[PDB]
Design a protein around this ligand. Structure first.
Ligand SMILES: Nc1ncnc2c1ncn2[C@@H]1O[C@H](COP(=O)(O)OP(=O)(O)OP(=O)(O)O)[C@@H](O)[C@H]1O
Ligand SMILES: Nc1ncnc2c1ncn2[C@@H]1O[C@H](COP(=O)(O)OP(=O)(O)O)[C@@H](O)[C@H]1O
Ligand SMILES: [Mg+2]
Ligand SMILES: [Mg+2]
Lengths: 365, 177, 351, 277, 210, 70, 52, 52, 105, 52
């Protein structure tokens, strides 16, 4: 069953499962903590059960920020109202020794597994950097007297990660929706800790560095983020067809970019220029402001419902918005807001000056 | 009488309202010419500007004192303040005089405009000078061109042009010095 | 294009999330579709070995094999990710021993080792913990013998031994499409065929994402349908031309109206080779659909809806011709003219 | 994974050498075309001072010619004059004028069909293949005079310098259909001229506008060929720039992969020798 | 454990609570990259530890733009909404104008087509880049940064081409009455009674590029 | 010829061979700079064509015939 | 690449060598034909970079 | 020697594909001229009115 | 190179002069210390070098300074191995170089 | 690609200044006079700055 997040690229191209395991693959600064905090903000309140945040090898500043903003959201209630809290925090952050970071994910799983099994209810398990589990085991593993495996890792990487990740499942008695940030070491997805984590996830959201350097946030690679829910027997034929159409347009753009970089756009065919224009449009349209990025961008964040993003991407695919420019799609919520941003961008196209005097900058008033 | 007030300065003021504002106005062939026709002056005395042209050449653009042109009625000479003229040129010899020297340019036909401001614009297709002509192919050319006349009217026209061109060429290559 | 005979090892190699188990799933679902229509002797009993996956992943597969009914002929050996490394390293041999019962008793097996790449990572774990010295990338020296010992057990036995067969489908995952990895180049040199699936073909809409240029079948056309031995020989020839004229027209230089006809028909065939997810086609509605494409009968049909055009070709052509094609195994001229006589009485979209 | 990057370095390097060759051959062909262009500009001037320059005439039939290129590595030349072609077809049209759209060059029928599919009627191509001559422009003008319009519009790129190409609209009026009507201002401006032809002034204007169309067409497709060469000279210069950028990034990437290859292949050897020692 | 080496070091740079004294420790780790590769191992290790980055590009450094701050890539979100309010007023439109300048410079890989609407922001951005660069060992107080960027993102600087904007910024700092710096420092932000005298005092300075 | 070198160089050459190799290696160096541009033959350049033809004159000179040392 | 062009046997005509390809062993008629075939194929190998 | 000198420049290039001798190339070129000149026969027979 | 640095360090310390040192091919110093570390049984670091690459280089290059007596100045020839300026031997060497003099053909 | 006299009047001034700058960077060396003949010229710093 689908889990609607309010993120356009996630709900369109790699939709999350309601009891699924979700991996956010990231490359040191591409935005998986902002994305996992937006998933907390968007999902964790609409979801009625309990929530567990396990911080494994991350910043202690981020743990303090999460604690102080879960208090003033009422998700954590201090004092005598503690029983009405919805979230428990387990923290093994990056100042801890490698033995504490290699076991704190298991403490988070135990807290979530009691709620799943004994209490019998639906849990959200947010694990920020499940990579640090693997990295801490490879730190302590050289001193256990083992022959090291590939790149520098423990020989027992896959079974350690498997024994941890096979416990974060839904059962007949309960449900754990698991969102895990997965750091990738040197922007290398063939590193064995991301490459081993990829098998354990129902929905991988792969975040790119080159997408984030185009300003497109969330920096989700639309042709590398998959899901088991992109299936026409699950999400409907219209959603499946608009997702596959968006992916085909973006793949044809990626196939064209090597000759676009050298020969320019002047050597394209006209259906190829239509492909490039629609692909730049949907590249900008997968971008979205976040309600947790509104504190450092100024733009307020937009939750986008699933039917709205389906209809918007279907309209850009059919051709209904070929008149609008590229930058009207950038960082807007709906397909209405690209029209109002073209209305705002267009109106200014004349408004540039004539603010000479009749100011508030006088000397007596 | 002039019910379409056309022109470049009207096209540039009407073109701003029917085109996108990003495109600048297209250029026109009036902006790449300098000497006009109706405008005052441009003669100053005994010389006058003679623009002897060709599609593939500019043979002269200096000033001459008299220009003999091979008009269809006959050879006329253009002096300084000549009457405005649109003369169609027969195959013949233009001679551009600039004193004692005379360049004998045999043209193959064309036009020659004398404008009101005294500018002579000879406009021919091929203009060979007389030294680079052979007198050998012109005689068998006239003999053969006075022979083949079918019932085609097109070849009658082409053969009449042939015999008048080669006959004027022999008239202007056997009468030289 | 990549035909598979009974007794052949065919590798399904590809990148991360391509159609690798989907080809393997459809081959098992299709055997249930064939076992109900053939006699008792030529029935194929499948084995799916699921090495190093989730339990959630294989619980979706037993749910799928019970829903279609393919679980009646299917063993499901599953050493999952939480299992001990000597259970994942042993599970293909355990599964191959179950499949070899059918090979050794005159019947026909089909084993699918999903992720032999994960069976080598579990074998590297045991070897490096038994202090055996590492080699390439960390693997033991014996890792070619790990898979060649297993894949040589898929055979086609003689009639003195029953005539049973075992068809293997090893699955190997590459990293960035880099087929020059260590375990990937071991199995490419073991198996007879190769089914390379690409991610950039997967996102262009081509599903199954089969790279036609790199996908080999060393048994050739000698072990395929004779009805498609004659209509798909030109299909792999017309697609070889289409690959070349689409590399040059990617620039946008020129078209020649005889080069563009190659680029026209090749785009019909790549839309013709598409297939959706959990619905295999028998053999004879395939070769009719390749007959409709390699004979020009789907020209003047727009390239966007040849996927939608061939539901009409299978629906409107009567099912009497599929029985003659299956029972003969070959388009006789008594059928070949009568096929194209009915391939004009069809309502294609657009027209 | 280090032979794909090496063959990509080889690919981008030979693309850059191909493109620098194309740039230097376009720079050479621009200079040999500048011999012919500046000589042909002379004959345009007597007809533009005799008949004037009247682009916005109220003709009820026009034949518009967009002078495009054959080869396509120009870098936005044919697209620029297709924009100018429709921005003059949306300007000079006044009342429901029949406009015949013609293209000179293969890159015109690829785009004027995309703009004006129904009014497009003729496609001249292969014209710069050997050279451009006046008999060739005369035959093209004869094929335009097979239609009988009241006006002609020629859309071409005026080669000004090696970097400046301005699009130009050059108008030729039909002789007494519209040209004499546009010259009379309470009397005439053409009746100043003593006509020295055999037959009437209608016949001398009928000959003179055919000659004006042939001259305008010859100069137009000389100017556009020179701007074609000088625009390929700048398009194959930016493409060598971007193929040097891509090559520098690929060489940095290849050296990173080379270093990483030596490190991991050495770490494998140490890890295999430390298990035995 | 080379990640742990830097992580356990940099995690000691905290802002303590009120019951621990309220003390703080700011860290500035320096990482040298090779040929601009920020996707290296130790670089991406420390990017995963620190709260932001200050990228210094060698292409901007070789062109004389010093400090060679890669404005698009450098980030400090924790220091945002913790900065000077007077500078936070002016720096928002500074950031948007520099974003537009970077994208209209990426729009022009070539000098052949001028737009005269992007040419405005292409000259305002080269104004702001010349405004931003400063010379070594002379740090500037925050009010004299605020007043200079106020004089740059608004008008008061459009007459100097690109060249004399350093001299113009020095003339802005020297010729404007030094009481307005005291008001900006003690009030912290720009009040309406303050940007009144900002628009007043900036028009009576004499800019050397005329 | 571009990658081959001799760090003794001109000090240990046959004099007289020294008198022709100084322009032979320069002319071959220019031909290597205009190399791979001789695929444009009708697309002439009239100044690089002389060095292209002379470089092709010189590279076909240096070829030899296998245990026939000169 | 020669197998993927449909040419079988997919022998690389340039990269294949023999010690019997000497003119004093197989004659000059065989040797000059083989060297000319390889020369034309290497010319097309250099020209395929600029044709494509 | 023949295909290298220009003796067989007048044959199609697919006449050389998968044939043994140059005699086979000459027999294949004219067999292709022969088959492609026999492609217009399915126009009015065995669509209907067939002789069982 | 340590022997040449001692000969220069006498002139710096005892004679009080401004000495030049010409370490010809500092890359060969790096290469030889790499071979010495390999023969002593040490595990090589990045690309192939000694683990002590920065320390064996800084042991040499930190004795070439200006003292209150005199100075030593080094004109060290630099080799770049794969024409790769990010290789650890020239990247570690360039951290000490105060100037580069490129001689070109 | 354009010609040495294609340039503007200011860029030819920079060409004539840089061509005589890069001549002035050369210098005869005192140790080279045993095989070059021309004596070597030590240049002081103030002379270099003033002349350049
Ligand atoms: N023929 C097809 N048509 C449409 N969708 C397909 C097809 N084949 C696979 N898919 C989709 O692609 C996704 C990947 O398929 P599959 O499960 O075969 O991947 P895989 O190669 O096994 O990847 P992994 O090894 O990571 O599990 C699935 O979600 C499936 O829904
Ligand atoms: N959705 C987003 N919107 C705007 N900026 C973002 C977004 N995601 C990330 N960023 C930028 O990227 C930086 C890194 O974010 P973070 O989630 O901490 O990365 P990571 O956890 O991958 O290291 C943030 O400081 C922010 O500036
Ligand atoms: Mg993080
Ligand atoms: Mg699978």
């Amino acid at each position: 069953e689908i889990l609607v997040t309010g993120i356009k690229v996630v709900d369109l191209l790699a939709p999350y499962q309601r009891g699924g395991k979700i991996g956010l693959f990231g490359g040191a600064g591409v935005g998986k903590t902002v994305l996992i905090m937006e998933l907390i903000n968007n999902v964790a309140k609409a979801h009625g059960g309990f929530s567990v945040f396990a911080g494994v090898g991350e910043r202690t500043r981020e743990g303090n920020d999460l604690y102080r903003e879960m208090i003033e959201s009422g998700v954590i209630k201090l004092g005598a109202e503690r029983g009405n809290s919805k979230c428990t925090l387990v923290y093994g952050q990056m100042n801890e020794p490698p033995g504490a970071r290699a076991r704190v994910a298991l403490t988070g799983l135990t807290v979530a597994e009691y709620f799943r099994d004994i209490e019998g209810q639906d849990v959200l398990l947010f694990v920020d950097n499940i990579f640090r589990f693997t990295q801490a085991n490879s730190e302590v593993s050289a001193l256990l007297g083992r022959i090291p495996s590939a790149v520098g890792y423990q020989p027992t990487l896959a079974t350690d990660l498997g024994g941890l990740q096979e416990r974060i499942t839904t059962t007949t008695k309960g449900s754990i929706t698991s969102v895990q940030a997965v750091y990738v070491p040197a922007d290398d997805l063939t590193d064995p800790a991301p490459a081993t984590t990829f098998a354990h996830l129902d929905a991988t959201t792969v975040l790119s560095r080159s997408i984030a350097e185009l300003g497109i946030y969330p920096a989700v690679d639309p042709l590398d983020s998959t899901s088991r829910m992109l299936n026409p027997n699950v999400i409907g034929a219209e959603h499946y067809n608009v997702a596959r159409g968006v992916q085909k347009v973006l793949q044809d753009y990626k196939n064209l970019q090597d000759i676009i970089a050298i020969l320019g756009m002047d050597e394209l065919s006209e259906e190829d220029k239509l492909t490039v224009a629609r692909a730049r449009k949907i590249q900008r349209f997968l971008s979205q402001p976040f309600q947790v990025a509104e504190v450092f961008t100024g733009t307020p964040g937009k939750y986008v419902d699933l039917a709205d993003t389906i209809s918007g991407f279907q309209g850009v695919l059919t051709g209904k918005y070929d008149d609008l420019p590229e930058m009207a799609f950038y960082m807007v919520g709906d397909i209405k807001e690209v029209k109002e941003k073209a209305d705002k961008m267009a109106k200014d196209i004349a408004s540039r000056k004539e603010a000479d005097n009749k100011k508030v900058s006088e000397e007596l008033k | 009488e002039a019910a379409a007030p056309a022109g470049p300065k009207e096209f540039t003021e009407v073109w701003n309202k029917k085109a996108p504002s990003t495109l600048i106005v297209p250029e026109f062939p009036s902006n790449y010419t300098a000497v006009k026709a109706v405008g005052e002056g441009q003669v100053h005395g005994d010389a006058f500007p003679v623009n002897f042209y060709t599609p593939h050449s500019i043979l002269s653009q200096a000033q001459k004192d008299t220009v003999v042109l091979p008009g269809v009625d006959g050879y006329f000479g253009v002096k300084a303040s000549h009457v405005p003229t649109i003369a169609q040129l027969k195959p013949g010899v233009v001679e551009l005089h600039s004193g004692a020297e005379s360049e004998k340019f045999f043209v193959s036909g064309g036009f020659a405009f004398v404008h009101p401001n005294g500018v002579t614009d000879i406009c021919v297709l091929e203009a060979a000078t007389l030294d680079q002509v052979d007198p050998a192919a012109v005689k068998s050319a006239l003999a053969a061109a006075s022979a083949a006349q079918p019932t085609d009217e097109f070849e009658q026209a082409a053969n009449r042009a042939a015999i008048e061109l080669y006959s004027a060429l022999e008239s202007a290559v056997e009468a030289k010095a | 294009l990549v035909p598979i005979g009974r007794g052949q090892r065919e590798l399904i190699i590809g990148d991360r999330q391509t159609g690798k188990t989907a080809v393997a799933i459809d081959a098992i679902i299709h055997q249930k579709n064939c076992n109900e229509q053939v006699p008792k002797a030529q029935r194929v009993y499948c084995v799916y070995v699921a090495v190093g996956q989730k339990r959630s992943t294989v619980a979706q597969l037993v749910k799928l094999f019970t829903q279609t009914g393919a679980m009646r002929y299917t063993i499901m050996v599953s050493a999952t990710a939480s299992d001990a490394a000597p259970l994942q390293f042993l599970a293909p041999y355990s599964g191959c021993a179950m499949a070899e019962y059918f090979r050794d008793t005159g019947k026909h097996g089909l084993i699918i080792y999903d992720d032999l790449s994960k069976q080598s990572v579990a074998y590297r774990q045991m070897s490096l913990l038994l202090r055996r010295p590492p080699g390439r990338e960390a693997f033991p020296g014996d890792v070619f013998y790990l898979h060649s010992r297993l894949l040589e057990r898929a055979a086609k036995l003689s009639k003195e031994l029953g005539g049973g067969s075992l068809t293997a489908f090893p699955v190997i995952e590459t990293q960035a499409g880099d087929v020059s990895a260590y375990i990937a180049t071991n199995v490419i040199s073991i198996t007879d065929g190769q089914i390379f699936l690409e991610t950039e073909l997967f996102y262009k809409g081509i599903r199954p994402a089969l790279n036609v240029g790199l996908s080999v079948s060393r048994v050739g056309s000698a072990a395929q349908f004779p009805g498609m031995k004659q209509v798909a020989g030109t299909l792999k020839l017309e697609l070889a031309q289409y690959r070349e004229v689409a590399a040059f027209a990617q620039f946008g230089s020129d078209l020649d109206a005889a080069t563009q006809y190659v680029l026209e028909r090749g785009a019909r065939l790549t839309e013709m080779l598409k297939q959706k997810q959990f619905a295999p086609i028998p053999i004879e509605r395939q070769t009719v659909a390749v007959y409709a494409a390699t004979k020009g009968f789907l020209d003047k049909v727009r390239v966007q809806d040849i996927v939608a055009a061939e539901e009409a070709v299978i629906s409107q052509v009567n099912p009497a011709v599929f029985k003659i094609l299956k029972a003969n195994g070959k388009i006789t001229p008594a059928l070949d003219a009568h096929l194209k006589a009915e391939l004009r009485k069809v309502k294609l979209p657009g027209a | 994974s280090n032979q794909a990057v090496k063959q990509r370095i080889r690919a981008i390097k030979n693309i850059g050498k191909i493109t620098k060759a194309m740039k230097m051959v376009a720079a050479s062909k621009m200079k040999n075309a500048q011999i012919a262009v500046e000589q042909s500009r002379g004959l345009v001037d007597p007809f533009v001072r005799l008949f004037g320059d009247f682009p916005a005439v109220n003709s009820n039939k026009s034949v518009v010619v967009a002078v495009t290129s054959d080869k396509g590595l120009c870098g936005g030349l044919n697209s620029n004059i297709t924009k100018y072609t429709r921005a003059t077809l949306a300007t000079t049209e006044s009342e429901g004028k029949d406009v015949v759209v013609v293209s000179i060059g293969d890159k015109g029928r690829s785009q004027l069909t995309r703009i004006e599919s129904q009014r497009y009627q003729l496609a001249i191509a292969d014209t710069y293949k050997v050279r451009v001559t006046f008999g060739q422009a005369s035959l093209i003008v004869e094929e335009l005079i097979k239609h009988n319009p009241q006006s002609y519009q020629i859309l071409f790129n005026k080669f000004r310098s090696a970097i400046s190409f301005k699009p130009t609209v050059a108008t030729i009026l039909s002789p007494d259909l519209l040209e004499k009507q546009l010259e009379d201002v309470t009397g005439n401006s053409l009746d100043a001229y003593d006509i020295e032809a055999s037959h009437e002034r209608s016949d001398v204007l009928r000959d003179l506008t055919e000659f004006h169309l042939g001259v305008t067409l010859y100069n137009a497709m000389l100017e556009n060929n020179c701007s074609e060469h000088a625009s390929r000279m700048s398009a194959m210069e930016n493409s060598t720039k971007s193929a040097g950028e891509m090559l520098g990034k690929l060489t940095l990437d290849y050296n990173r992969k080379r270093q990483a290859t030596i490190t991991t292949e050495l770490i494998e050897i140490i890890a295999g020798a430390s298990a035995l020692m």
